[PDB]
Design an enzyme around this catalytic site. Sequence first.
Site, PDB file in Angstrom:
ATOM      1  N   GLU A  60     -22.991  69.051  39.017  1.00 14.98           N
ATOM      2  CA  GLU A  60     -23.107  69.098  40.382  1.00 14.98           C
ATOM      3  C   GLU A  60     -22.589  67.840  40.892  1.00 14.98           C
ATOM      4  OE1 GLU A  60     -24.036  71.774  42.181  1.00 14.98           O
ATOM      5  OE2 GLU A  60     -24.197  72.539  40.252  1.00 14.98           O
ATOM      6  N   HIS A  76     -21.344  91.604  40.748  1.00 13.58           N
ATOM      7  CA  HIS A  76     -20.283  91.361  41.289  1.00 13.58           C
ATOM      8  C   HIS A  76     -19.492  92.486  41.631  1.00 13.58           C
ATOM      9  CE1 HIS A  76     -21.261  87.884  39.129  1.00 13.58           C
ATOM     10  NE2 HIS A  76     -20.932  87.143  39.993  1.00 13.58           N
TER      11      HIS A  76
HETATM   12 ZN   LIG Z   1     -20.807  74.373  38.961  1.00  9.21          ZN
END
Ligand SMILES: [Zn+2]
EC number: 3.4.-.-
Lengths: 597, 195
Positions: A357, A487
């Site tokens: 992150e 998806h």
């Molecule tokens: Zn990521």
Amino acid sequence: QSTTEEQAKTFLLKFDHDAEDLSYQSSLASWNYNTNITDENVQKMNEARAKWSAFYEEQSKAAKMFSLEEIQDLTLKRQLQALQQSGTSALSADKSKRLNTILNTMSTIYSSGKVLDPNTQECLVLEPGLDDIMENSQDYSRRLWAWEGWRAEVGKQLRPLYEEYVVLENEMARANNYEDYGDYWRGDYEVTGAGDYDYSRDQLITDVERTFAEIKPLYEQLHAYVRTKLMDAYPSHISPTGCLPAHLLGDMWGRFWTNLYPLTVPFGQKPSIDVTREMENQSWDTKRIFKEAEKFFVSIGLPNMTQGFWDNSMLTEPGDGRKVVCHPTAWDLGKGDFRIKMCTKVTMDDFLTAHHEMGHIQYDMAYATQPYLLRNGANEGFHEAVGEIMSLSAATPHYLKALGLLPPDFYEDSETEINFLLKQALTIVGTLPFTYMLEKWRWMVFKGKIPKEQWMQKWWEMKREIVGVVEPLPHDETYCDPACLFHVAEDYSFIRYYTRTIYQFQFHEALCQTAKHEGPLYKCDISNSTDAGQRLLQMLNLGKSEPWTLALERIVGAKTMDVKPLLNYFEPLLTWLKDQNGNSFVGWSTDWTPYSE
Amino acid sequence: TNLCPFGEVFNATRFASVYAWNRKRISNCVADYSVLYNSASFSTFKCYGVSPTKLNDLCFTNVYADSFVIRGDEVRQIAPGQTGKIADYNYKLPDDFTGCVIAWNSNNLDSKVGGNYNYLYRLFRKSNLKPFERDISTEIYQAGSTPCNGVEGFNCYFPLQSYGFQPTNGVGYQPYRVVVLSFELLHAPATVCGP
Ligand SMILES: [Zn+2]
Ligand SMILES: *[C@@H]1O[C@H](CO)[C@@H](O)[C@H](O)[C@H]1NC(C)=O
């Protein structure tokens, strides 16, 4: 008097000033909802997003008055070309309403899917009842009934909608001078007019097929090894030379083979590296985890986290009764505001996700100086490939040994390294053929090559041919198997996951060569190497202001995708896989099916 | 001892916008600059043409204090020779300069939850400002041949644009209060002196 180039600059100067504020308000509205799930905040978020979307729609039509052939500046042309695209507004109003209601119906049916257990007392959904059956089980009948039940419930209703969705989306693609919807999706990798650094929408297929051709030999060895290990669990249901059944692939769709690790571990007597026990022996808190993650990026020359990051970010689960969304995310709210949302815990996995992150955050802080319309990655695959190379380095024994989480006298066995490479190969190598096959099928469906009455006669034919997976039960045209994936049902492109895997290993190899590391690539660590941070920041700085081919060349040295670094990473595992498969047949014969006999 | 009122230029409830800044003339007093450069509140103290020390040993005839509020990234444009939007269209400093520039963060005062849109700046102008020139005209800009006659339309923009200040913005987007002291010297009894 002015040229078009000097009026389309004033227009963009006004646009940036308005759009920055509107988008920042929208992002704040969304942040107040993710970190506090309530009822009022949903309405506030909806209002903010609607306002931003309306403003963007008006400016899209506003930007079209200025032609593109009369503009010489490349950056101005890129900025105006980003804004000129309309999208679904080119269709008729009734057709747009039909598209919106079709997509909403598909989302509602997927999210509300229900399956009935043969035991009437149990009713299970995909999240998490069906998943717990799929990932953690070792019987054949339960996985068979679950796998057939989910498809039989959702595909029958999703099949008629897909045909209308395909024809309507193809009409919209015809509106914008695109041949079909597949070309509209492949237009995210297109560079036009740059010169030698150019790329055509039809070149992506050639590059993808060429790259998969080299990858296939390694995947065949891994497939044979997994089949031989699957002999010991289902002796009477798998052929020695046939394709693996689709319901024994570790999850619902077979996208990742990670869950097959306990069955197929090479040396099960050696435990994997887990520093959680020693992480709790020093009373590590979450803030310390993020502080060591920050130190990792400090050591390689990248900048430091801003002060507002520490105050505004939600780095732990609140305990005052607030309900939150616990999916780890990195937020670029705009106006220099960067945050991270994570319900972190004292575990090794969260220690790695912190580095991932923070790598996303570093990319966002790196390209912040570019114009507003050029503050993105080079394409869809660049942003998620930068993060993975940080978690690759954060997990090496050399990183933890210098971090105090491992004793300096720690001795690592080749058995543990082989186990680690096997678990890496199950996730990375095992997912590429599935992604390539699924996106190829969708592209050929949109292109009109596959007739509507031959949708399930080719889908399985490719699955056996490319992925080496056979269906357990024959299916007719009343089924819609691809729509059973999240998806596909929600209209999301899938080829970004294929290219991200290639880019991440090209980046890792280049950055390891810069640091002058010696030895196998999977042992590489780029800590303390201030020379690799400069090369990384040469690519991170550009953002979307230079063609993705040149952005790739600035960090690696070539302007094309290449799978040779990916094969280099897994070379020690391949040299061990060939010896194991020496007495077993490799390759899959398509004729054998579980249902035939 | 009649000391100069430096406490009503730095120590103020309301400041002025960039496009219409406030100029105050200081004369006929003694100036104790020791309070300024010995204060740690200021984040930018750059003196052009003189030395910050020994500043209170010269006598001038007038001092002009120009005060306004800008963003974080626009404090570098308050200097002789710099170019940008603030330098070109809002506040211009001559190439030769005898004075000081003082700037400090004012996030606690000028930023409010929901936005503080009370500060404006000029984004469009036909030509650059001359040194120490103030423009407060509010007329529709025009980038096209056809005049739009006072109504905003296509290629006709309003030239004054608002500032959005929020407490959660980055350091570069946070409000900053700027005071520019210019020491002018003419033939006169040199009223402004030091202690
Ligand atoms: Zn990521
Ligand atoms: C502004 O107020 C503070 C608070 O007392 C004071 O210390 C400072 O000297 C004042 N500014 C000036 C220029 O006197």
